[PDB]
Design an enzyme around this catalytic site. Sequence first.
Site, PDB file in Angstrom:
ATOM      1  N   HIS A 106       0.816  -1.223   0.000  1.00 16.13           N
ATOM      2  CA  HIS A 106       0.000   0.000   0.000  1.00 16.13           C
ATOM      3  C   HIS A 106       0.851   1.275   0.000  1.00 16.13           C
ATOM      4  O   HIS A 106       0.298   2.359  -0.168  1.00 16.13           O
ATOM      5  CB  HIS A 106      -0.928   0.065   1.219  1.00 16.13           C
ATOM      6  CG  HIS A 106      -1.924  -1.050   1.302  1.00 16.13           C
ATOM      7  ND1 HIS A 106      -2.846  -1.283   0.306  1.00 16.13           N
ATOM      8  CD2 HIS A 106      -2.151  -1.980   2.264  1.00 16.13           C
ATOM      9  CE1 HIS A 106      -3.600  -2.316   0.649  1.00 16.13           C
ATOM     10  NE2 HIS A 106      -3.207  -2.754   1.837  1.00 16.13           N
TER      11      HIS A 106
ATOM     12  N   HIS B  67      -5.935  -7.592  -0.387  1.00 16.77           N
ATOM     13  CA  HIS B  67      -6.132  -6.167  -0.661  1.00 16.77           C
ATOM     14  C   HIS B  67      -5.419  -5.765  -1.940  1.00 16.77           C
ATOM     15  O   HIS B  67      -4.413  -6.391  -2.324  1.00 16.77           O
ATOM     16  CB  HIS B  67      -5.595  -5.329   0.495  1.00 16.77           C
ATOM     17  CG  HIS B  67      -6.239  -5.669   1.805  1.00 16.77           C
ATOM     18  ND1 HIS B  67      -5.691  -6.584   2.690  1.00 16.77           N
ATOM     19  CD2 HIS B  67      -7.403  -5.243   2.361  1.00 16.77           C
ATOM     20  CE1 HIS B  67      -6.488  -6.682   3.747  1.00 16.77           C
ATOM     21  NE2 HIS B  67      -7.531  -5.887   3.570  1.00 16.77           N
TER      22      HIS B  67
ATOM     23  N   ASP C 174      -3.759 -13.074   3.709  1.00 12.57           N
ATOM     24  CA  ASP C 174      -5.024 -12.631   4.271  1.00 12.57           C
ATOM     25  C   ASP C 174      -6.240 -12.987   3.440  1.00 12.57           C
ATOM     26  O   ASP C 174      -7.340 -12.748   3.893  1.00 12.57           O
ATOM     27  CB  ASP C 174      -4.995 -11.125   4.651  1.00 12.57           C
ATOM     28  CG  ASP C 174      -4.354 -10.243   3.590  1.00 12.57           C
ATOM     29  OD1 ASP C 174      -4.011 -10.672   2.458  1.00 12.57           O
ATOM     30  OD2 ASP C 174      -4.175  -9.034   3.898  1.00 12.57           O
TER      31      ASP C 174
ATOM     32  N   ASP D 236      -2.147 -10.973  -1.982  1.00  8.24           N
ATOM     33  CA  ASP D 236      -2.728 -10.393  -0.768  1.00  8.24           C
ATOM     34  C   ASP D 236      -4.181 -10.058  -1.104  1.00  8.24           C
ATOM     35  O   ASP D 236      -4.485  -9.646  -2.245  1.00  8.24           O
ATOM     36  CB  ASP D 236      -1.926  -9.123  -0.430  1.00  8.24           C
ATOM     37  CG  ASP D 236      -2.343  -8.489   0.871  1.00  8.24           C
ATOM     38  OD1 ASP D 236      -3.448  -7.866   0.925  1.00  8.24           O
ATOM     39  OD2 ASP D 236      -1.593  -8.604   1.852  1.00  8.24           O
TER      40      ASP D 236
ATOM     41  N   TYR E 275      -3.160 -12.383   8.807  1.00  4.41           N
ATOM     42  CA  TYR E 275      -3.273 -12.050  10.238  1.00  4.41           C
ATOM     43  C   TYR E 275      -3.677 -13.177  11.142  1.00  4.41           C
ATOM     44  O   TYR E 275      -3.595 -13.039  12.362  1.00  4.41           O
ATOM     45  CB  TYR E 275      -4.204 -10.822  10.414  1.00  4.41           C
ATOM     46  CG  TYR E 275      -3.713  -9.712   9.532  1.00  4.41           C
ATOM     47  CD1 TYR E 275      -2.560  -8.995   9.871  1.00  4.41           C
ATOM     48  CD2 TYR E 275      -4.329  -9.447   8.291  1.00  4.41           C
ATOM     49  CE1 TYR E 275      -2.035  -8.022   9.026  1.00  4.41           C
ATOM     50  CE2 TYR E 275      -3.830  -8.454   7.441  1.00  4.41           C
ATOM     51  CZ  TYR E 275      -2.681  -7.742   7.824  1.00  4.41           C
ATOM     52  OH  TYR E 275      -2.110  -6.801   7.005  1.00  4.41           O
TER      53      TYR E 275
HETATM   54  C1  LIG Z   1      -9.658   0.607   8.218  1.00  7.05           C
HETATM   55  S1  LIG Z   1      -9.580  -1.072   7.896  1.00  7.05           S
HETATM   56  O1  LIG Z   1      -9.759  -1.276   6.496  1.00  7.05           O
HETATM   57  O2  LIG Z   1     -10.444  -1.731   8.822  1.00  7.05           O
HETATM   58  N1  LIG Z   1      -8.037  -1.408   8.268  1.00  7.05           N
HETATM   59  C2  LIG Z   1      -7.035  -0.998   7.294  1.00  7.05           C
HETATM   60  C3  LIG Z   1      -6.228  -2.100   6.676  1.00  7.05           C
HETATM   61  C4  LIG Z   1      -6.701  -3.399   6.657  1.00  7.05           C
HETATM   62  C5  LIG Z   1      -5.922  -4.355   6.057  1.00  7.05           C
HETATM   63  C6  LIG Z   1      -4.705  -4.015   5.482  1.00  7.05           C
HETATM   64  C7  LIG Z   1      -3.902  -5.067   4.812  1.00  7.05           C
HETATM   65  O3  LIG Z   1      -3.903  -6.247   5.202  1.00  7.05           O
HETATM   66  N2  LIG Z   1      -3.248  -4.716   3.706  1.00  7.05           N
HETATM   67  N3  LIG Z   1      -2.606  -5.715   2.934  1.00  7.05           N
HETATM   68  C8  LIG Z   1      -4.299  -2.685   5.556  1.00  7.05           C
HETATM   69  N4  LIG Z   1      -5.038  -1.749   6.168  1.00  7.05           N
HETATM   70  C9  LIG Z   1      -7.646  -1.662   9.603  1.00  7.05           C
HETATM   71  C10 LIG Z   1      -6.956  -0.658  10.283  1.00  7.05           C
HETATM   72  C11 LIG Z   1      -6.536  -0.842  11.587  1.00  7.05           C
HETATM   73  C12 LIG Z   1      -6.831  -2.006  12.258  1.00  7.05           C
HETATM   74  C13 LIG Z   1      -7.544  -2.980  11.586  1.00  7.05           C
HETATM   75 CL1  LIG Z   1      -7.976  -4.430  12.424  1.00  7.05          CL
HETATM   76  C14 LIG Z   1      -7.969  -2.840  10.264  1.00  7.05           C
HETATM   77  K   LIG Z   2      -3.762  -8.209  -4.134  1.00  8.31           K
HETATM   78 ZN   LIG Z   3      -3.828  -7.378   2.813  1.00  2.00          ZN
END
Ligand SMILES: CS(=O)(=O)N(Cc1ccc(C(=O)NN)cn1)c1cccc(Cl)c1
Ligand SMILES: [K+]
Ligand SMILES: [Zn+2]
Length: 353
Positions: A133, A173, A264, A171, A304
């Site tokens: 990201h 996301h 994830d 991933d 996670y």
């Molecule tokens: C605000 S949220 O979306 O709940 N989120 C943002 C987020 C989620 C996943 C990833 C990730 O795994 N990226 N590969 C990055 N940022 C989030 C922010 C803080 C704590 C938690 Cl549990 C979730």
């Molecule tokens: K991806």
């Molecule tokens: Zn992710």
Amino acid sequence: PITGLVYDQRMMLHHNMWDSHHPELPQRISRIFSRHEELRLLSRCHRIPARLATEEELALCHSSKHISIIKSSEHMKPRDLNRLGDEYNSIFISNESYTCALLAAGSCFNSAQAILTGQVRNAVAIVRPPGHHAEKDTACGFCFFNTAALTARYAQSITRESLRVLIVDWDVHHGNGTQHIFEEDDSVLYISLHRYEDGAFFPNSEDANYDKVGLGKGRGYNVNIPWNGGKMGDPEYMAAFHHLVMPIAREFAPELVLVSAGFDAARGDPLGGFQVTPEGYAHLTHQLMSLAAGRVLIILEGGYNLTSISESMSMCTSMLLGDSPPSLPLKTSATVSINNVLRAHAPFWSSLR
Ligand SMILES: CS(=O)(=O)N(Cc1ccc(C(=O)NN)cn1)c1cccc(Cl)c1
Ligand SMILES: [K+]
Ligand SMILES: [Zn+2]
Ligand SMILES: [K+]
């Protein structure tokens, strides 16, 4: 015919001082490393040392301003760490964050080097914080510097500027930072599979949709495979690889493959909500091994559930080591997603016609 592995316990030092249960935990990497020992994979690998990325290497993808700002966090008091982290979308920072980010990137450079100098055929990098990201000018989503994007440029910096690098980002996301860094670039093919939900799923941008195909000379070299309509798993990931990832990759003919390997999308992950199994990740790895004369570097991103990521990443390493793969109908909306991407990319890739 050797597999490299990089892991350094110093990357555990990055932590959330305000919420010790934040899911991007220090023990993500130690649990994965321990599982490799338990499965007797560690002793089968060639151990590659971690090192710090240099600021010049960070400048392959990041602005000098952004590098300077993250480096300034090293000597901040808690209040100012909180203030700085809050300038970004979903970042926490401790005094150790910058050093950990540098080690994650440096580890991946040494792994790419080991592959491209012929010391190992392929490699796995058990690193945190994650990268995909992170943008040229900003941190985001638990990521400070874009490790995988930096690694592609580092690989180009020791071979040739036009070295063909495929980044497969599985991933759950979208790697917004990776897409943006390479959006006008035909030397780096970015292929992401990700939960999208029409923009409801993090990072909440239409940049992740299937119609974002690349810009300028990079047109056709950005492939987004967005999922909508809830739980997906092995059948959908296997179909996306069969119809899209593998035919496009074969036509691109990469000289190096990097996997932005978040776990994830795994069964059990609290953030992803998907059901990809360890055997599923192993099959995806085995497919990618058919590319680039086997030159594959697997880079940890998100993921996670400590048990899920440990089993899934270990199974990928088992594949890299040459162990026999597993021998494994789609959700309606998954067929819709795959057909949307096929229609978006057929103008650029003859294999899709
Ligand atoms: C605000 S949220 O979306 O709940 N989120 C943002 C987020 C989620 C996943 C990833 C990730 O795994 N990226 N590969 C990055 N940022 C989030 C922010 C803080 C704590 C938690 Cl549990 C979730
Ligand atoms: K991806
Ligand atoms: Zn992710
Ligand atoms: K690209």
